[PDB]
């Protein structure tokens, strides 16, 4: 996360972190339930063996409320391909249940129509993670959040060197030095409504970090709802 504020106690309870054997956070996730994590498909390429961590806000100080979970089954979307970055979505079935406590709680899954009509027509959304705070800097040590404006779908394409597909959507700023960055992938993009948060997107890609004329590209969660449900029943 380049810029933006820090996630204060209890603010980003649905954040999940994928860690490699070196316990290095390399990607993000969104807690969907005591058993499931939502992430980006391309994140299952940035590591070999990995576990998902929750309840963490500072990767260097045992806050006590953290917890590590192993992966029983990872559900990648077949249609996903790295040459287009289309269908950048995956579901993770946890071996053991996530016990919800302070800093550890799930984000709601909205309904397709209401979501597209009310959630994304909103002014902004929130993205977060332990990713880099600059394009060349290092992986953040503290979990961060950032209010990113929804970006008109046209400009999105007009500014993109790559085809923004039906399963993606732009969010962020044109010049303002704020946007997600490396390591934030798979992380959550949530929209607030009457003090209740709903998953609306997965951190997918972008050309560099916070570049002028460039936007953050998120996976359109509303476009895989039924898919996400089919995965919850494991399939």
């Amino acid at each position: 996360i380049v810029g933006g504020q820090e996630c204060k106690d209890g603010e980003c309870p649905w954040q999940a972190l994928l860690i490699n054997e070196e316990n290095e956070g390399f990607c993000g996730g969104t807690i969907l339930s005591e058993f499931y994590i939502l992430t980006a498909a391309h994140c299952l390429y940035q590591a070999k063996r990995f576990k998902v961590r929750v309840g963490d806000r500072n990767t260097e100080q045992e806050e006590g409320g953290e917890a590590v979970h192993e992966v029983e089954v990872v559900i990648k979307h077949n249609r996903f391909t790295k040459e287009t970055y289309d269908f950048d979505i995956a579901v993770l079935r946890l071996k053991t249940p996530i016990t919800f406590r302070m800093n550890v709680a799930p984000a709601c899954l909205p309904e397709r129509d209401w979501a597209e009509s009310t959630l994304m027509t909103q002014k902004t959304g929130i993205v977060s993670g332990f990713g880099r705070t600059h394009e060349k800097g290092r992986q953040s040590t503290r979990l961060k959040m950032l209010e990113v404006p929804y970006v008109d779908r046209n400009s999105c394409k007009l500014s993109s060197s790559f085809i923004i597909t039906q399963n993606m959507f732009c969010a962020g700023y044109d010049t303002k030095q704020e946007d997600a960055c490396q390591g934030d992938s798979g992380g959550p993009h949530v929209t607030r409504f009457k003090d209740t948060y709903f998953v609306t997107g997965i951190v997918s890609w972008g050309e560099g970090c916070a570049r002028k004329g460039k936007y953050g590209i998120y996976t359109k969660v509303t476009a895989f709802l039924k898919w996400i449900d089919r995965s919850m029943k494991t399939r």
Binding site: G10, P13, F100, N103, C108, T196
Partner: protein, 51 residues
């Protein structure tokens, strides 16, 4: 009707029935007695910041 007015005055999901609105909630919530508000069932309902 008119889930477009102010989300039909619902707390979460709003639907229309040719003439009226029909509110509904996310998993873990139960529709209140006014058929509009949503109420949690556990101490950790989805989408709430554990402040």
């Amino acid at each position: 009707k008119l889930c477009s007015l102010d989300n039909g005055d619902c707390d979460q999901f709003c639907h229309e029935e040719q003439n009226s609105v029909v509110c509904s909630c996310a998993r873990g919530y139960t529709l209140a007695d006014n058929g509009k508000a949503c109420i949690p069932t556990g101490p950790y309902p989805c989408g709430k910041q554990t402040l």
